[PDB]
Amino acid sequence: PPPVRLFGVEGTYATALYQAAAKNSSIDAAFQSLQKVESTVKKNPKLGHLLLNPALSLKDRNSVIDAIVETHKNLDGYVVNLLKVLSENNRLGCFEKIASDFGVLNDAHNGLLKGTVTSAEPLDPKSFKRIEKALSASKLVGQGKSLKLENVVKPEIKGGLIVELGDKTVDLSISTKIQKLNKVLED
Amino acid sequence: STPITGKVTAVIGAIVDVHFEQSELPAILNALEIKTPQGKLVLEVAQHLGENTVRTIAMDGTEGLVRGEKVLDTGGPISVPVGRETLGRIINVIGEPIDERGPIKSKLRKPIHADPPSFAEQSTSAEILETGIKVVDLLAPYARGGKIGLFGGAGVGKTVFIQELINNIAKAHGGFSVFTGVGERTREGNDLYREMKETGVINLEGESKVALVFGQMNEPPGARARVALTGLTI
Amino acid sequence: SILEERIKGVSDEANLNETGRVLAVGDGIARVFGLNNIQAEELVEFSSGVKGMALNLEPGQVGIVLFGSDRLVKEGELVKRTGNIVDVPVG
Taking the C-alpha atoms of residue B4 and residue B48, their distance in angstroms, rounded to an integer, is 15
- Distance (Å, rounded) from C-alpha B136 to C-alpha B47? 45
* Chain A residues in contact with B52 (beta carbon < 8 A): 58
> Do B61 and B43 form a contact (C-beta atoms < 8 A)?
no
Give the 3-state secondary structure of residue C70: helix
Domain-embedded: residue C35: yes
CB contact under 8 A, B28 and C74: yes
Residue C89 lies in a domain: no
Residues of chain C positioned with their CB less than 8 A from the CB of A39 = none
Q: Indicate whether C1 belongs to any domain.
A: no
Least Cα distance to B91 among B179, B158, B167 occurs for B179
Residues 6+ apart with CB under 8 A from B31: B42, B43, B44, B45, B74, B75, B76, B77, B78, B79
Closest CA relative to residue A93, chosen from C20, C4, C59? C59
B53 marked as binding residue: no
Mutating which of C2, C4, C13, C21 best tests the A interface, going by the most A Cβ atoms within 10 A?
Answer: C4
How far is CA B75 from its chain centroid? 19
Q: A-C interface: how many C-beta pairs under 8 angstroms?
A: 31
> What DSSP string describes chain A?
--S-----TTTHHHHHHHHHHHTTT-SHHHHHHHHHHHHHHHT--SSSSSSSS----SHHHHHHHHHHHHS-S---SHHHHHHHHHHHHT--TTSHHHHHHHHHHHHHHHTEE-EEEEESS---HHHHHHHHHHHHHSTTSPTT-EE---EEE-TTS-S-EEEEETTEEEEE-SHHHHHHHHHHT--
Q: What is the DSSP letter of B137?
A: H
End-to-end CA distance of chain B: 27
Q: How close B109 comes to chain C (CA, Å)? A: 19
Q: How many CA atoms lie within 13 A of A54 on its CB side?
A: 23
Instruction: Provide CB contacts within 8 A for B170, sequence distance 6+.
Output: B177, B201, B209, B210
Closest CA to B37 of B63, B7, B18, B57: B63
SS3 state of residue B153: coil
CATH 3.20.20.60 fits A11-110, yes or no: no
Q: Which residues, other chains included, contact A32 with Cβ-Cβ below 8 Å and sequence gap of 6+?
A: none
Taking CA atoms, what residue in A is nearest to C10? A60
Q: Give the CA angle between residues B66, B67, B73 to the nearest 5°.
A: 90
Type and span of the H or E element at B75? strand B72-76
Rounded to 10 deg, the angle between the A59-70 and A78-89 helix axes is: 150
Residue of B nearest to C22 (CA): B50
Cβ atoms of C17 and C35 closer than 8 Å: yes
Q: Which amino acid is at C16?
A: L
Distances in Å between the alpha carbon of A24 and those of A78, A95, A127, B178?
9, 22, 42, 73
C41 part of a folded domain: yes
Question: DSSP string of B165-229?
Answer: HIIIIIHH-SS--EEEEEEE-HHHHHHHHHHHHHTTSS-SSS--S-EEEEEETTS-HHHHHHHHH
Q: Which amino acid is at C40?
A: A
Burial class of A14 by CB neighbour count within 10 A (0 to 12, 13 to 18, 19+):
buried
The answer to whether B147 is a known ligand-binding residue is: no
Distance from CA of A79 to the nearest CA of C (A): 19
| Determination technique used | cryo-EM
Residue B133, amino acid: I
d(CA C87, CA C43): 9
Asked if A29 and A74 touch (Cβ cutoff 8 Å), the reply is: no
CB count in 10 Å sphere of residue A60: 17
Out of A53, A55, A67, closest to residue C6 by CB = A67
Residues A35 and A13: their CA atoms lie apart, in Å, by 16
Classify B161 as helix, strand or coil.
Answer: helix
| Structural domain of C46 | 12-84
The CATH number of the domain where C67 resides is what?
Answer: 2.40.30.20
For A78-117, give one letter per residue: b (16+ CB within 10 A) or e.
bbbebbeebbeeebbebbebbbebbbbbbbbbeeebebbb
Which residues in chain B are contacts of A59 at CB distance < 8 A? 22-23
Q: Where are the beta strands (DSSP E) in C3-78?
A: 20-26, 29-34, 42-46, 51-57, 62-66
Is there a contact between C35 and C20 (Cβ–Cβ < 8 Å)? yes
* Cβ–Cβ < 8 Å for B35, B65: no
Counting Cβ atoms within 10 Å, is residue A69 exposed (0-12), middle (13-18) or buried (19+)?
A: middle
Report if residue C30 sits inside a domain: yes
Q: What are the angstrom distances between the C-alpha of C71 and each of A172, B52, B71, B163, C74?
A: 65, 16, 20, 37, 8
Tell whether C80 lies on the interface with B, counting CB pairs under 8 A. no
- Looking at the structure of chain C, the number of domains it has is 1
Are the Cβ atoms of C7 and A71 closer than 8 angstroms? Answer: no
Q: Active-site positions of B? A: 158, 184-185
Vertex B212: Cα angle to B211 and B213 (nearest 5)? 135
Going edge to edge, which strands form the sheet with B31-35? Answer: B8-12, B15-18, B54-58, B40-48, B31-35, B72-76
Residue C20 Cα distances to A93, A111, B53, B133, C63, angstroms: 20, 47, 21, 61, 11
Q: What is the dihedral of CA C73, C74, C78, C84, to 10 degrees?
A: 30
| Cα–Cα dist B227/B189, whole Å | 14
Residues listed for chain B:
234
**List of chain A residues whose C-beta atoms are within 8 Å of the C-beta of residue B51:** 57-58, 90
Distances (CA, A) of B130 to A87, B141, B171: 69, 7, 13
Query: What whole-number distance in Å separates Cα of residue A116 and Cα of residue B38?
Result: 69
Report yes or no: C4 at the B interface, CB cutoff 8 Å.
no
How far off is chain B from C18, nearest CA to CA, in Å? 22
Distance CA A70, CA B93 (A): 53
Judge whether C80 lies within some domain: yes
